[PDB]
């Protein structure tokens with residue numbers, strides 16, 4: 001009788017007590033509850049999140065290109081994640097671009113070197 | 121993190137990138153060679169949504185994925201779709217074709233492709249005049265190697 | 268080091284002198300098309316320091 | 317490869333052209349401060365592979381031929397610094413018919429005005 005994976009999407013309980021539930025293996029039903037905001041993603045049926053048309057960077061990865069976030073009253077939104085700004089290079093067979101100035105950047109890189117030594 | 125678009129009309133000194141640049145005729149914005157690559161590797165299951173009504177019956181025992189799901193073993197879908205990975209690779213190709221290596225170090229600075237090849241011939245200890253004097257032969261060799 | 272640049276590391280990106288590489292996406296992986304310069308048709312000469 | 321030297325590997329030590337790095341000790345780890353050179357404020361120019369002067373192709377020794385619309389210069393690749401094209405900036409290789417994109421300009425000679433005096 002039992003079948004199908006279930007994931008619950010939450011902002012921190014410190015922030016809210018709303019949740020959205022993802023029913024992979026359901027094509028919107030075998031759901032715990034349904035209401036408004038039923039959205040069918042390729043990872044399953046997402047219930048409890050409002051689907052928007054914008055695209056943002058990922059906040060909570062849902063899968064198959066969909067992310068969720070808690071944005072503004074407040075609510076949980078689901079969207080297609082944005083890969084970055086669309087750009088274009090003005091290429092031609094005789095045009096070049098030469099930098100006339102520069103920046104001195106200083107970036108940080110953190111690497112673990114050791115872990116805790118333990119005895120039992 | 122910049123999605124460089126492919127230049128409209130391809131004038132790359134005789135170098136042909138048609139086989140590796142994204143193809144709009146196809147539903148996926150995948151190149152020709154990427155499709156050859158995706159037809160070779162066969163996956164266990166495509167879609168990540170197998171419904172209960174599909175596994176209902178003796179199809180449960182017959183199908184392997186149904187037998188896995190009925191015992192609690194789930195396969196989770198990846199976060200990036202194959203179309204998104206294809207957009208990333210097309211951005212890398214459009215950045216490396218039109219700007220050389222400059223797009224990896226900062227803003228993409230355009231440069232004619234044959235001039236970039238002359239740079240790279242310098243990079244291995246061959247004077248650029250060799251490239252400019254065998255431009256057509258080198259482009260033909262590259263095209264046949266891609267083919 | 269091979270799509271975003273030109274590598275001098277030997278055999279890191281193809282056999283030969285690396286010119287450039289092109290990434291292609293495969294299922295669960297990545298395919299690199301390494302373009303290298305391979306010398307051909309050698310000829311003997313007399314030399315001197 | 318980045319504190320005890322300068323790395324040419326792309327993106328091995330910071331995004332940009334690596335200048336130097338400084339190690340800092342963190343708990344159970346290490347922190348590198350990668351100092352890189354990032355080009356800025358690009359500007360478009362017209363360029364050319366070679367240059368015809370006397371029925372000979374002239375290629376730049378180091379740098380690229382650029383023009384501000386009327387006058388042709390040779391500049392280094394990562395910083396705009398135009399200079400007058402000269403037989404010191406360039407080298408000759410063959411005649412003109414072979415290079416596609418070659419451009420007609422004059423190639424100055426530093427000796428010519430002097431020895432006449």
Ligand SMILES: *[C@@H]1O[C@H](CO)[C@@H](O[C@@H]2O[C@H](CO)[C@@H](O)[C@H](O)[C@H]2NC(C)=O)[C@H](O)[C@H]1NC(C)=O
Pocket residue numbers: 027040041042043167169
């Ligand atoms: C959920 O079901 C619908 C139909 O019940 C699927 O949409 C169909 O997808 C197939 C792909 O082979 C098309 O041939 C059909 O024409 C589509 N039907 C409709 C009504 O558009 C949908 O793909 C299923 N969802 C998922 C993500 O599996």
Ligand SMILES: *[C@@H]1O[C@H](CO)[C@@H](O[C@@H]2O[C@H](CO)[C@@H](O)[C@H](O)[C@H]2NC(C)=O)[C@H](O)[C@H]1NC(C)=O
Pocket residue numbers: 100101102
């Ligand atoms: C290169 O960029 C620097 C900025 O990093 C420019 O220096 C600035 O110059 C303006 C006036 O020209 C001052 O108001 C700023 O305070 C300067 N900034 C710093 C940090 O000194 C510099 O002029 C630029 N060079 C070129 C070629 O334009």
Ligand SMILES: *[C@@H]1O[C@H](CO)[C@@H](O[C@@H]2O[C@H](CO)[C@@H](O)[C@H](O)[C@H]2NC(C)=O)[C@H](O)[C@H]1NC(C)=O
Pocket residue numbers: 136137138139
């Ligand atoms: C790049 O290569 C493709 C093939 O790999 C060329 O497409 C061919 O073009 C010729 C004549 O235009 C046709 O007869 C072939 O049938 C085409 N093949 C395919 C599969 O498309 C394309 O023309 C080349 N690009 C350039 C600019 O030469």
Ligand SMILES: *[C@@H]1O[C@H](CO)[C@@H](O[C@@H]2O[C@H](CO)[C@@H](O)[C@H](O)[C@H]2NC(C)=O)[C@H](O)[C@H]1NC(C)=O
Pocket residue numbers: 309310311
């Ligand atoms: C460079 O010189 C060597 C020495 O003559 C050539 O190698 C010989 O080639 C002949 C075939 O004609 C063999 O029978 C010999 O055994 C080879 N080695 C020796 C030790 O003599 C070599 O072919 C020449 N290379 C080129 C590209 O001309």
Ligand SMILES: *[C@@H]1O[C@H](CO)[C@@H](O[C@@H]2O[C@H](CO)[C@@H](O)[C@H](O)[C@H]2NC(C)=O)[C@H](O)[C@H]1NC(C)=O
Pocket residue numbers: 090358359360
């Ligand atoms: C170099 O030249 C290109 C082409 O003129 C410039 O790119 C264009 O910028 C305008 C805005 O003024 C856009 O409307 C065009 O769509 C851009 N591209 C094309 C294809 O024309 C570019 O800004 C110039 N770069 C610099 C630094 O001057």
Ligand SMILES: *[C@@H]1O[C@H](CO)[C@@H](O[C@@H]2O[C@H](CO)[C@@H](O)[C@H](O)[C@H]2NC(C)=O)[C@H](O)[C@H]1NC(C)=O
Pocket residue numbers: 384385386387
């Ligand atoms: C391109 O650069 C050259 C050299 O910088 C410019 O020519 C000079 O322009 C200044 C300003 O009027 C004059 O005082 C010099 O005598 C000029 N030199 C010569 C020999 O012509 C030229 O004007 C620039 N062209 C453009 C259109 O930017």
Ligand SMILES: *[C@@H]1O[C@H](CO)[C@@H](O[C@@H]2O[C@H](CO)[C@@H](O)[C@H](O)[C@H]2NC(C)=O)[C@H](O)[C@H]1NC(C)=O
Pocket residue numbers: 093094131416417
């Ligand atoms: C750069 O490209 C332009 C066009 O994209 C080339 O201009 C052509 O030049 C030939 C000369 O034989 C003319 O017959 C064509 O009519 C021109 N095309 C157009 C539409 O202007 C130009 O020659 C190319 N330059 C290089 C560096 O090869």
Ligand SMILES: *[C@@H]1O[C@H](CO)[C@@H](O[C@@H]2O[C@H](CO)[C@@H](O)[C@H](O)[C@H]2NC(C)=O)[C@H](O)[C@H]1NC(C)=O
Pocket residue numbers: 368371420
């Ligand atoms: C660049 O200069 C060369 C020679 O200085 C020009 O070639 C001449 O072109 C004319 C007309 O086509 C011919 O009658 C001459 O016989 C050519 N001379 C030689 C020796 O080739 C060339 O046309 C110039 N290029 C441009 C576009 O101005």
Ligand SMILES: *[C@@H]1O[C@H](CO)[C@@H](O)[C@H](O)[C@H]1NC(C)=O
Pocket residue numbers: 014015
């Ligand atoms: C999270 O918890 C802290 C301390 O409990 C609280 O100060 C903060 O307001 C909480 N965050 C939100 C947005 O409610």
Ligand SMILES: *[C@@H]1O[C@H](CO)[C@@H](O)[C@H](O)[C@H]1NC(C)=O
Pocket residue numbers: 051052053
């Ligand atoms: C998103 O866009 C589609 C078509 O572009 C439209 O049908 C749909 O109503 C839009 N959704 C929202 C939330 O407005």
